[PDB]
């Protein structure tokens, strides 16, 4: 038997933006969404996981113990107890997370990294099945599990994540992230309030339509079309949220966006805003350093990002 296994996954950015969860426990997406996994050029933005045999079950986030009192992570660990018993000689395992270049705690990358560790121990499991269990940890786990550009189809009862383009399809593109210091609306507030909107039923249908449009663009590697659409999706999504009192795009964020509209006439860009106080700007690689070097970031900090692949495991120890 072994004693432990490590794994790694990368954080994600929504491309067709998710709002609404079917149930607080299983956390199935109410409608179809799409996303990309990202890191920096070195691959240093990441979540690293260690699952190991133990006398009692402990959950740690960057060294801080969690009472995991919802049994969010512990639910997943219990479901795959047979995997751990075979691999480690015991059903009792602990989980230790270290996040780098993202905030300490649970995330899409954290969830996917759990999946990669389990698959690492039992490689003939169906990752689409494992994904269903991972959503309890984070509803967009599939983006990070499979990597690249994905679509997660969903009718609110059954959800399925499909790989649409490899990270290699974006090698000519970069994303400059502008991080603003405004306190963010929790994702749970986003999910809870968006469904109150009278436009919500049409949004769910519009979401599914946009994902089909993305699958079509993929046929000819139309990366600009995909990101152009992501910006249109972003604008619809945040117009719906504002009408339910959730305002993600704050004053200095809107000022940056206005400038983006100006330089768009000079060279191509498209932007995305998800749930946090960040503005993500897609750009052609030849213009990435130029964008990154602009002077008036309106008090935002800058990171150079790129599209990367799915979660992966290390050999068990
Ligand atoms: C707010 C948001 O990040 C929620 C994902 O659960 C939107 C998205 O990325 O699809």
Closest atom of ligand 1 to CA, residue 33: 10
For the chain, the DSSP string reads --SEEEEEE--EEEEE----BS-TTT--BSS-EEEEEEE-TTS-SEEEEEEEE-SS--EEETTEEE--TT-HHHHHHHHTHHHHHHHHS-S-EEEEEEEESS-SS--HHHHHHHHHHHHHHSTTS-HHHHHHHHTTT-TTHHHHHHBSEEEEEE-SS-EEEEEEE-GGGGTTEEEEEEE--SPPPPHHHHHHHHTTSTTHHHHHHHHHHHHHHHHHHHTTT-HHHHHHHHHHHHHHHHHHHHTTT---S-HHHHHHHHHHHHHTTTS-EEEE--SSSEEEEEEEGGGHHHHHT-S--SS-EEEEEEE-B--EEPPP-
Torsion over CA: 212, 216, 219, 224 (sign): negative
Structure solved via: X-ray
Resolution in A: 2.0
Cα Dmax for the chain = 62
Kindly report the number of other CB atoms within 10 A of residue 35's CB atom: 27
Look at ligand 1, atom 9, and give the residue with the nearest C-alpha: 14
CA torsion angle 12 13 19 21 (round to 10): -10
Q: Is 95 annotated as a binding residue?
A: yes
The two structure tokens encoding residue 62: 């960057």
Contact, 195 vs 201, CB < 8 A?
no
Q: Which sign does the torsion angle of CA 171, 302, 295, 255 carry? A: positive
193 alpha carbon – ligand 1 mean position (Å): 13
Residues β-bridged to residue 159: 154
Burial class (CB in 10 A: 0-12, 13-18, 19+), 56: exposed
Nearest alpha-carbon partner for 106 in 59, 148, 51, 151: 59
Cβ count within 10 A of residue 163: 16
Q: Which atom of ligand 1 is nearest to the CA of 140?
A: 6
The Cα 210–Cα 226 span in angstroms is 9
Specify whether the backbone of 36 is left (phi greater than 0), alpha (psi in -120 to 50) or beta: beta
Distance, CA of 32 to CA of 155 (rounded, Å): 7
Angle subtended at Cα 13 by Cα 156 and Cα 275, rounded to the nearest 5 degrees? 75
Q: Whose CA is nearest to atom 5 of ligand 1?
A: 18
Is 106 annotated in a binding site? The answer is yes
Q: Report domain extents, the chain.
A: 1-10+40-147+309-317, 11-39+148-308
Q: Is there an atom of ligand 1 within 6 Å of 14 CB?
A: yes
Within 10 angstroms of residue 291's Cβ, the number of other Cβ atoms is 21
CA 73 to chain centre: 17
98 is in an annotated binding site: yes
């Amino acid at each position: 038997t072994y004693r432990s296994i490590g794994s790694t996954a990368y954080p994600t950015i929504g491309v067709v933006l998710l709002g609404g969860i079917a149930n607080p426990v299983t956390r199935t997406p109410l409608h179809t969404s799409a996303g990309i996994a990202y890191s920096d050029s070195c691959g240093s933005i990441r979540s690293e996981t260690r699952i190991y045999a133990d006398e009692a079950t402990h959950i740690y986030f960057n060294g801080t113990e969690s009472t995991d009192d919802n049994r969010s992570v512990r639910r997943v660990l219990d479901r795959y107890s047979s995997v751990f018993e075979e691999a480690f000689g015991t059903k009792t395992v602990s989980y230790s997370s270290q996040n780098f270049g993202i905030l300490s705690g649970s995330s899409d990358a954290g969830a996917a990294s759990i999946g990669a560790a389990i698959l690492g121990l039992k490689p003939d499991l169906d990752p689409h099945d494992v994904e269903n269990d991972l959503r309890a940890v984070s509803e967009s786990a599939g983006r990070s599990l499979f990597g690249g550009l994905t679509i997660t189809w969903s009718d609110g009862f059954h959800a399925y994540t499909e790989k649409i383009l490899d990270p290699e399809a974006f090698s000519g593109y970069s994303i400059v992230a502008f991080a603003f210091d405004y306190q963010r609306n929790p994702s749970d507030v986003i999910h809870q309030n968006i469904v109150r909107s009278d436009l919500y039923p049409a949004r769910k249908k519009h979401a599914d339509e946009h994902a089909h449009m993305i699958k079509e663009y993929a046929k000819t590697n139309d990366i600009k079309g995909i990101f152009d659409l992501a910006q249109e999706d972003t604008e619809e999504y945040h117009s719906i949220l504002r009408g339910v009192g959730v305002n993600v795009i704050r004053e200095n964020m809107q000022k940056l966006i206005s400038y983006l509209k100006l330089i768009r006439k000079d060279y191509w860009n498209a932007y995305i805003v998800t749930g946090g106080s960040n503005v993500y700007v897609a750009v052609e690689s030849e213009n990435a350093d130029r964008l990154f070097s602009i002077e008036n970031t309106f008090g935002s900090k800058k990171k150079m990002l790129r599209i990367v692949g799915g979660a992966w495991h290390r050999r068990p120890e």
